[PDB]
Amino acid sequence: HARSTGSYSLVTQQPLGGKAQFGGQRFGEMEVWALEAYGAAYTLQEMLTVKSDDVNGRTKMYKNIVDGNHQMEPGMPESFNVLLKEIRSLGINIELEDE
Amino acid sequence: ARVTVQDAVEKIGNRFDLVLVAARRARQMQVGGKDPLVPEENDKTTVIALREIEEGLINNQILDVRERQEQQEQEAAELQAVTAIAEGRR
Amino acid sequence: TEEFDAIKIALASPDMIRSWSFGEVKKPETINYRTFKPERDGLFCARIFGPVKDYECLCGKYKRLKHRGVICEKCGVEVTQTKVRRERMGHIELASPTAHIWFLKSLPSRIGLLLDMPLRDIERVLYFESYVVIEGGMTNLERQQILTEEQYLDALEEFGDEFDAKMGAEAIQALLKSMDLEQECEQLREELNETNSETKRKKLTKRIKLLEAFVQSGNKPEWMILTVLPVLPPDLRPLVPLDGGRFATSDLNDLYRRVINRNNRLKRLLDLAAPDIIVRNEKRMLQEAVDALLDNGRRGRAITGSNKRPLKSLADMIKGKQGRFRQNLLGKRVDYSGRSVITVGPYLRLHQCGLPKKMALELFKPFIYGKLELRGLATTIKAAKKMVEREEAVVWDILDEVIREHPVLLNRAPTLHRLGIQAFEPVLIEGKAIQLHPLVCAAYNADFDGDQMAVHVPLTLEAQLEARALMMSTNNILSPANGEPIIVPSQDVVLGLYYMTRDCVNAKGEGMVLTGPKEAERLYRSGLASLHARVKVRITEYEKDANGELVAKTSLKDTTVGRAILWMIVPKGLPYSIVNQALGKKAISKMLNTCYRILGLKPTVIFADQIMYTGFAYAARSGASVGIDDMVIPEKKHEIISEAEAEVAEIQEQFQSGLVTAGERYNKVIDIWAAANDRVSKAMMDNLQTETVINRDGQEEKQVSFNSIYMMADSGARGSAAQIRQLAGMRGLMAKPDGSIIETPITANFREGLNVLQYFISTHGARKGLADTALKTANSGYLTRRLVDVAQDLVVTEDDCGTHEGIMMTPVIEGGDVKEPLRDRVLGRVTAEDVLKPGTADILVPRNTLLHEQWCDLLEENSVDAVKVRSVVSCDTDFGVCAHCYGRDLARGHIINKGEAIGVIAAQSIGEPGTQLTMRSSIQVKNKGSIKLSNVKSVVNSSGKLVITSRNTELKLIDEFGRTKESYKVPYGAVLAKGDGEQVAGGETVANWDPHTMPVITEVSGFVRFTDMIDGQTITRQTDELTGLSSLVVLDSAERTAGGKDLRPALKIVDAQGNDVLIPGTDMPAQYFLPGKAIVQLEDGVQISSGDTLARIPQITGGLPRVADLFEARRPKEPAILAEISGIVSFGKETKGKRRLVITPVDGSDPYEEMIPKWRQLNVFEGERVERGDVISDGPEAPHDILRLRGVHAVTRYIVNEVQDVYRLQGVKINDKHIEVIVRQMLRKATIVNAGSSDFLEGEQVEYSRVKIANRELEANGKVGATYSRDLLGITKASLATESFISAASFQETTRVLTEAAVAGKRDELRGLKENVIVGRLIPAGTGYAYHQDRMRRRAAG
DNA sequence: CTCTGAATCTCTTCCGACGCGCCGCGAAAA
RNA sequence: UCCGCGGCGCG
């Protein structure tokens, strides 16, 4: 099976899982530590920000690749925003600092 | 073809600064349309970006001095254009 | 873009949480069904959470982008993007103020500690079963007492409105509004100074730290109760459409609708002014409903739906493996990925992997589109999709073009070690399976059993560069756990090499002399000479000179023609002598390592590839195969089994005659069967290993046999001695699941037919092993996850720290042998001091120098015994370690580079072997050497022998070079047969002791007079039954009378006339107490000699749990007690169930007292003096005791010794550094004894780095520094103690971590790697480190 | 003979790899 | 159609 680009889960904008729904593979925490050991921080950031979560970043990246430019455009993962909202629902003030 | 990069790592010393400097060189290669300082033999931009490091003609210091001379030469060209415009207006 | 510095957490005040909301929600409805539209005031209200479609009004009045930011007059819905449905949060106001579940119930109850109330009465109050009182006027009853209903009534009639009492929910906040924390903190401080009890001070200290955290943080405690509850934006809780217009409800919606129902009902109920019973029941129902909404299931039975499922709450969505953190934030599913089954690709090179064409097309489709646009063939992306779907022939050519140098990351689930992800430069193959290079199959731990693995492609130029530089399989050929090479030929290649180098005494074309390996190739490929022919050939070899020049030499030497063929592929620098042998897996490993250490990386890569090819080729030409006739059965087997049958038969008859016991017969039957097994195994190996051959002269000769199985096992290619032993000989004497040997041997071999009962016995071990192997993975993974999450913070930052403390290193000796040489244990470390030549003050090795191979060779030549090296446990760097203390980097041979995350590497290197683990009287000198005695105070008896009067005495065997090789413990009071420094030979006894008896000794000679000798109060008169000899038995403290309880029977040494005999060197007379239950045969007033004795005193864990406990610092069930202060030991006043041990310090002013349970056999005599940390009793020692007594260095030596012992027993190699670094992360926290000039409070626990830098700045100001102790926190606790609260929340125990952080207003600086990877910015390690060094330079500058 | 502190017992909480694949099936709510 | 829960196997 091979996914490339396709549908996204509505809740967290992450790609689906499962071949039947044409979903991508899962880059679990084991692989996160694997990259962590080697270093390769740029590859990990690319993974997390563009290929998985940041809608704006992945869109800009897609345009870049179509144009032949291969420059990273980092962005805040939407899953983290989800977490921020969920904690904010608990009755807890959580916010970014030095904004 | 490039089977291993250990020679380039020796040239730069630390692998991380190597990859950063090579990334900068390749990025200015791909989008800036610059010139390859070594015969490319139809290789991709990334590998020739490593090869110029392998030659040793380029590192962080030379990259910095080249970028700095480029930018101040652009500044001087802009100043010359402004001077020519002022002379035409005067 | 936002470049936020940090994350702050604080309590949600009602006013600000009101500001957060875009408004309230009134009705418990979601959408209309006639038109799928939200209700006017429901949980999806367009007025509240925004439009249902991008830039479209709810009523459709405005439908053009020019209307941006316009709130429709007709319907009132703002026109904007639908994205705001993810942002804007709702709110609900509660008719009654309602508290939070977390702060109410999460132990310890924060509100409870805020007050002095116990948690039980306040919780029963908050559910409205009792009142709380606010005082006014002069009743007997004060404020803050719990008052039930009828007491409230009689107080109401007695006192009226003079006093206030209330039902729970509002009363809690009302009281919370009624204290000033400053007066509270000062009064508790003066109470702390006043109090003496330790438990009381514990309670008041926790209370004061909590309330001072409130004061400092600025959050108001009354905010703990909620008057407004925010509603999560609808987009995060979608109502999933179903077939036919139906919907599936997200769990949050049901709970929210329940809360809305209860709140509206309570509002309308209060509006009607109904009696208090109805409103109180309704409001307690609302309380429980909101409790379920927040943290459903924490208290009582969780509310459940029609599907009898326990409904998910907000809290449940964060905690757990399925929660947001573990499932989503880490391990986000990625695009551009594929997965497929693997297939051996032999024709591949080392670094290129075969990829199915279809997968390549799908993965690189963005690039295909890009290049198609570049060449102009496709005018639009629609066209590109067409032709890429139409698989036009140009598309394949473009595909070859794009992948020309674009590496792909390749992973096999599950990743166990950093070698589990590698990057390859792909090639295209037909089919639907990924071809893999055979070598790396060992590294991936793949076995080609239909196992699947996945592929990802980097996108940025940066990521491609990381892949080609770092992750390329051509690099990282050395494992980080230990320097041993990972790419090791095995199985077929080993078989081919071994078959190629083997010789046969008679072969075609032997004896002929051949000019060179080229003509050897000609000869064999012409079939004129067999591979095993021994001939003489001319060869040439080269070696690096002092300048590295390859000076050449050549000559004629004997060689098997196969080995001559091998010499082609060797690199130009290898010496020939290495190849000249019967190549095996160990030899080949040494060979490749040799060429790696001598020549460059490219020669080694090329050599590995060529050896791969040649091994496969000549194994193919070998045709080595296994036949049924190969497992030849020795004829002696029938005889040996016959003999054993007789031996067991006669033994059984002897047992039936009553001559021997059942257990004795069992043991000797086991022994004779084991002997028979040894005999037959030896005979079978002897028969197999050798074959009879014919020479040139026809004479009989012998050679190593060419039987297939023998060569398969000998070469090490997928085999060993045990399996071949089981193939044709005895199978052995394995055990039942309980571990008992069945006493009935498994007779036949596998070539023979195992009988039914035999085989069914054989299956028990197999089932046990399979079950254990299956079940171990869970614990192994868990242990890895904990270790990683503890060690994730460390990263090498500074080049060096100006410190000179270090770790003493000495080869480990147990049982009389060296378990690990000093060469291994110190290779790759950095010198802590100037190594001195033995016996001289001359500097041998300078300080701060790396221990590479040449230096270790020099050290070995000088035969140095012990050396001090820097360790990460001693590093002084704050928030990091220096490069030198971590020493050499294993994977690259050179010193470690700044930015390498050593912590994660070490954690994974511990974890990877975790799979391999398994969880379910006299001393002889072994070698010639010199006897050494240490930690000894000894005497010479009248017999001329030696007796030891000291504990922890150790006996060493030391060579003439000064290097110890044997080490043993010396029991107290033992008999020693050799003097110090005496030379001894192997197999020689030197000391003796009675294992099951604890004797007493007398260094002086004199008449022993017995004191405190009273029958029934200290002793009793007895006569030995078997001998009739008179004896005195010392009674126990309770066995004796009450009056004699504290009387101490004791021997006294006097002269012939009774004058006191004094202890040598002291004025104290010699008196030896008599312990309880002791027996003495001699009588009062009997002369004894010097060094004379008279006393009669009587005398496991599975691997993976063992390492888990050692790293977690489990308190052992039976801990050994250690002395606290050095002094003379004594027994205090007798106690109940325990003995009162007392130490009177030699010069200290305060004696020390301990309760020790009476059943414990104390090792030390009462009449003894102990040193700091002396061992009082046997048993394992808790590491905390080691830490507080013997200092950090003892602990870090102990932990590494034990863990390395476990792995060494398992045989897995791993460098001591990886244990050391974990232990360093274990010692994070530290407590304070005296604050000095610091602002800290005595008894508080803080970061070791924080207290260290505080002391540094204090002494830099000349002020008094803090006196501290370092506490050993377990890995879980130490993980929960990190300054960054995000990492702890991600780890485990999420509710408590979040609650504590919120209550304390902690500021998280996203320092660690895990927190940064959560946020999504580049991690501060490796390639990212430089960027952060570009950031912290300028953010401080800015 | 009584009171307080210290220590144990009793209860409550947390948590046991991970990646898929396959299969089926929701409702006193509309 | 994309939601959730339970069972089964593979590695």
Ligand SMILES: [Mg+2]
């Ligand atoms: Mg397998």
Ligand SMILES: [Zn+2]
């Ligand atoms: Zn409208």
Ligand SMILES: [Zn+2]
């Ligand atoms: Zn250091």
